[PDB]
Design a protein around this nucleic acid. Sequence first.
RNA 1: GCAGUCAAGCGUUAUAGCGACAUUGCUUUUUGAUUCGAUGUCGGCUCUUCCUAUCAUACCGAAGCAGAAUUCGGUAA
RNA 2: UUCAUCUAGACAGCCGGACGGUGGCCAUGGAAGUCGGAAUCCGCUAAGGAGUGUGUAACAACUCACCGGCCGAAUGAACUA
Lengths: 299, 171, 19, 158, 70, 65, 234, 72
Amino acid sequence: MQLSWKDIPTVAPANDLLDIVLNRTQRKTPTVIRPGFKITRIRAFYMRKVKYTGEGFVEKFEDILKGFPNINDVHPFHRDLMDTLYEKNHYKISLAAISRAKSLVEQVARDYVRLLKFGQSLFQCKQLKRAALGRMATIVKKLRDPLAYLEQVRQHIGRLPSIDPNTRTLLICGYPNVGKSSFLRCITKSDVDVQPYAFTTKSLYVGHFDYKYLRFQAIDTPGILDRPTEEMNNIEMQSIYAIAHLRSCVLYFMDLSEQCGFTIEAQVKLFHSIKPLFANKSVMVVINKTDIIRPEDLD
Amino acid sequence: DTQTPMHTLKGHYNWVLCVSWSPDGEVIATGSMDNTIRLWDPKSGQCLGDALRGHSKWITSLSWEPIHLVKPGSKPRLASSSKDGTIKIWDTVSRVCQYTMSGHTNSVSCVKWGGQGLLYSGSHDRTVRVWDINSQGRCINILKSHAHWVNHLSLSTDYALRIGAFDHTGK
Amino acid sequence: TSWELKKQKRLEDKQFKER
Amino acid sequence: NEVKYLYLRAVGGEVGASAALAPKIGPLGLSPKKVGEDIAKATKEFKGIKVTVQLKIQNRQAAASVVPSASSLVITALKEPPRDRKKDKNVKHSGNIQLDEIIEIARQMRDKSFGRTLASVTKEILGTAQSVGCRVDFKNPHDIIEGINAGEIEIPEN
Amino acid sequence: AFGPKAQRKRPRLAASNLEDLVKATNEDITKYEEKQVLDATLGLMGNQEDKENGWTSAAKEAIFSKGQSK
Amino acid sequence: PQNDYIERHIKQHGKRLDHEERKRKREARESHKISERAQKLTGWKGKQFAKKRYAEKVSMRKKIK
Amino acid sequence: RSKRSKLVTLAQTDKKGRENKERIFDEVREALDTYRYVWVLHLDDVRTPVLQEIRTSWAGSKLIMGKRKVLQKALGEKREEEYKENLYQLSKLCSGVTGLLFTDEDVNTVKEYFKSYVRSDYSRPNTKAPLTFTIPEGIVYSRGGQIPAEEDVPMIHSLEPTMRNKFEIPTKIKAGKITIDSPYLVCTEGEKLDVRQALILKQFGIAASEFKVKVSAYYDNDSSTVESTNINME
Amino acid sequence: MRVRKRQSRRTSTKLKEGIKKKASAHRKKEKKMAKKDVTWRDPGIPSNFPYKAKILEEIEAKKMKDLEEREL
RNA sequence: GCAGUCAAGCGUUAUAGCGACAUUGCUUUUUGAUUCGAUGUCGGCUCUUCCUAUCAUACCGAAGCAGAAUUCGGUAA
RNA sequence: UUCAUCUAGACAGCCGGACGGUGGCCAUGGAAGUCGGAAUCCGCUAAGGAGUGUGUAACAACUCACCGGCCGAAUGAACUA
Ligand SMILES: Nc1nc2c(ncn2[C@@H]2O[C@H](COP(=O)(O)OP(=O)(O)O)[C@@H](O)[C@H]2O)c(=O)[nH]1
Ligand SMILES: [Mg+2]
Ligand SMILES: [Mg+2]
């Protein structure tokens, strides 16, 4: 497992990529050819133009294709998290579009170099080279939407926390406003925000600590609402997949003062509803906010 | 019989997108592009008063209430779907609109009035909604298995519900 | 005075334009 | 003591509607359960309707009332069947309201309105009805407004 | 699907319930573990272990590419 | 750092003390910068700059229309 | 070349022309015929809810605002240009933001209403400070000490550049909260306020000043005379 | 401070004669295209001229006079 | 490239004809899977200098640029 | 060159107003003009968008579309060479 994907190179949009590759050809290859030169020299000039431009496009596409994770080959927790965040169907379709564009660009380059082998004049060779480059430009401009999507995905995926699913884990869960981020702040040096309104935290946050010379991670999640998975949303699905995948000790937090906005009956019902989620994992129920009300003086 | 025109129905202002003959054979309903539904007496070739207005987009399908569920001495009602995502039920004797089903988030492809007091609607929101007329038009069921627009839907009793009390003999 | 003349020229130009 | 007023928007008839009131309830020391119960009790007339709830706080109390609003009154006059959020989504408010009911809503909203005439208050209510998308006298609400402008519709209280 | 203008707030094909969801996750975890064992019996015992030691395979000789000339 | 750490850092610590004024003066200077680029860029860069300016003017006219 | 380029906006409301001024002119001249008393009101820095409350209270009368030059032209500027006899004095008594109250009510009723009408208003610049305001040390809150900070809400972090630059209040951001190292004096009682101090008071929402509608004079149709009333003209 | 090569402005005889031939060919082609192609084929009084009213009155008076002068 | 669409303009009083910028279809369709006829000139060695259309080194600007690393760009031979 | 605006006050600038039904309907964990999808109406106006942008988790706040006060005389746009 890799656990981190920040080392993905910048994905240029379609027009920017076209500008970059075409201007790289115009700068890094010689530009002066004369009609009074030998036809072999003219043909070599334009063949080099076509081959170099194709190589530039293929290099950019290969950098895109090697950088992004293979979503079906990562750990299933990472697969589910990235499917929730980025819609795996769109993710794989965009990367397949990049692959198809790479193959088409290679085919264009090979075909027009083979055609340029039979060019009889500078005008014909120039027309063939311009045709090859224009077809490459058409192929690249067809990628305008997947490139924008992949640039946004790259920026977002570089900032995900590194969660090892095979290390020692304290999972924190419950309703909103019960003190989950406060507990993570208490036990780790994570900077998760603590605010008195629901869903201040919209993503998984990781902290670390040491116990008996052993490194433990702690996952603070967005709150879960007592709803079926049919009407559950992606933010809650992050927590659902965390509890389902990470073998750990789960801490279900309860606010008996009802300051979180949810009744004790609702908290008990949520616990019994997500009871099938934590099976064969350690479970503990933590009653937070004992400085307002206590279990012993309840009803 | 003679393959000649008999009547012309010229009430609408835009394209007549759908026509439907009543299962009792007494009235023709035309739903048009101008977001209207008109009813016509076929024998006189005339318009029964004014158009049925209320839809904001064009009519996509018209379905009739079955005769075998309509109590005797009464005329069947008209369900109508449209591009605006609504199914409107029209009582034609009083020329009023009773129920307005609204659960669809996109254009309704088709509406069908089944033989057990149910309405089945297929819409571009990739879902099929089953409504009960005996429960004030509430959406009893939402069926979600398609990944795209449901273009059409058909019932096993569609021919019987279209034909009503008639047969191949025409009696 | 001066503004009166400017207003008068404005009126004359408008009348010429409409004619 | 002092009278502290808080305002909220909540679907009527649902107990525990003070989830968003915790940042406001906090300093006061009120009970969230009691506040939700009082809101549900005050919202008995409006079931499944997003209404404006006003809470008055004196000493250590919490009294809930409903502040009438044009949209809530129009939706109430629409006489739609009660709905749950799980069952029915994307409701189109396209019922029929009569001129007398529109005038009654205008009478209810006349006290806090700058419309100098009952006709003006009625036209405001009809604009709100056009916003909610309903029908008035089997007509367009703006058609009724144009009729009032022309003079076909007579306002009773002059 | 994703971005500043994203309108996808719910999963398209939600699971039936939590019991089916945890059954699917357990099945996926088991398949992943078996696949990891099957691939690590060969690859991690071979090529990837050499990367720790800084070793590289000898460059392929040109005599084995004869017959593939343009 | 994790998630939207730069946004949270701006929310918690603010920006540089001269950020707003610096951005405002750069945006004010942009008109002089555009004219200097149009009169100073040579060759391929000048041609591309003029082409892009014409496209932007056409797009702005279409938006106004 | 080398000219300033106008900023372009794409909004719905377009500018009013001379037709609006002509319409206001005709409305004023028709109300001059229709009503008996024309009262000149000074309503500078009036808020729209206050003005609309005044209009609602004066149901049956006509309150007309607009450009003061348009109003004076409607009333007649000079003695040969007056719409009615002895109206040029009323026209030349219009100063500042001027409103015209055309009515048939009693002089006593108008005087009593405009003496007894008052509302809470923001402390405008170049006025007198109604109170001494001091932002307390530590975390800055929305009211700035006008209510207990336990009940108050902390000031949003987005306002710190405005307070530091526009308001010139030395502020810091600490854990997303606005803080001042020392208590800050904003205004002193019985002192002239400027734009900056008035903006600080408005930002903290303190409204201890009073709004009173000034009345200059009035004109009677039948008498054709103008009498100075001098209400709230201290 | 590295100054580049300046483009020469000394006239080339071959370039000038070639430009002459190119210009003559261009003129002949433009004339031919103007003869061959198909394309369908008074600013009035300037607004700043002071006696616009006088000019307009004179032209109107001449029009009205010539209305009856040619008729009878 | 071919075939269209739009229209800021040009043209006109016959709502013909040219037409920038944009844009569609084909080539090329969805889950990142899995070598085809150069008909006539080419390579080295040693060694010098020039161009910039800059790969590295210098100084800068931008970018979800935390750090580290990297990408795009400016002056620069 | 042609259009417009102008002492019942032109262009810049400063200050003030920028409202009420209403937190319009749907949707959302939250969405109050300003993540979105469809309405885009009425009142009171001197004028004020069912909102031009910044901003908030949502509000708040600022802005500009428009209007007014001070100032007092020419100004703005699009083309041609
Ligand atoms: N009195 C009290 N308040 C608490 C305690 N724990 C948390 N809070 C308050 O609860 C509010 C929300 O807590 P938060 O960390 O955001 O919980 P989360 O939303 O579930 O992650 C914060 O403003 C805290 O001040 C506690 O033990 N006692
Ligand atoms: Mg939290
Ligand atoms: Mg260079």
